[PDB]
């Protein structure tokens, strides 16, 4: 019992990100968090508060 | 050209592959199963007394 409600935890956890996940597709918005968005600072060269933006 | 500036047109990552980090609780109770065993086999023995003599 003890081996399946340890692995229990990791389902719920994964569960509280594709909710939110889930959420943000629906409002029209990026989910950074899912994406790497690493490579198109190098490709166009911008600070990094203009990438917050 | 003219005035305004050309910047070439930047490439993108066809797919991205999401892998979450979860946190690691480190129970201890699991993979003890050879105590368990060790417990199973305790092989107590008792030698008649009076059957000798
Ligand atoms: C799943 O089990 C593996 C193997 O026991 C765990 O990986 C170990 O994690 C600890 C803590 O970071 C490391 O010190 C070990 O070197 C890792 N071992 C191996 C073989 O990778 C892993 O942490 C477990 N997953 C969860 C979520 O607890």
């Known amino acids: ?10 389902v719920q956890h994964v569960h509280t990100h594709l909710n939110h996940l ?10 950074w968090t899912y994406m790497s968005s690493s490579w198109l600072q190098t ?4 600070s990094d508060d203009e990438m917050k933006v | ?18 892998e979450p980090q979860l946190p690691h609780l480190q129970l201890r109770l699991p993979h003890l199963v050879g105590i368990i065993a060790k417990i199973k086999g305790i092989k107590i023995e008792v030698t008649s007394s009076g059957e000798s003599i």
Do not use: H, N, W, Y
């Open chain 1, 1 to 10: 019992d003890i081996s399946i409600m340890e692995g229990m935890f990791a």
């Open chain 1, 43 to 46: 490709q166009l060269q911008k």
């Open chain 2, 1 to 18: 050209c003219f005035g305004v500036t050309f910047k070439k047109p930047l490439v993108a990552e066809e797919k991205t592959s999401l």
């Open chain 1, 22 to 31: 889930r959420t943000m597709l629906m409002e029209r918005r990026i989910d």
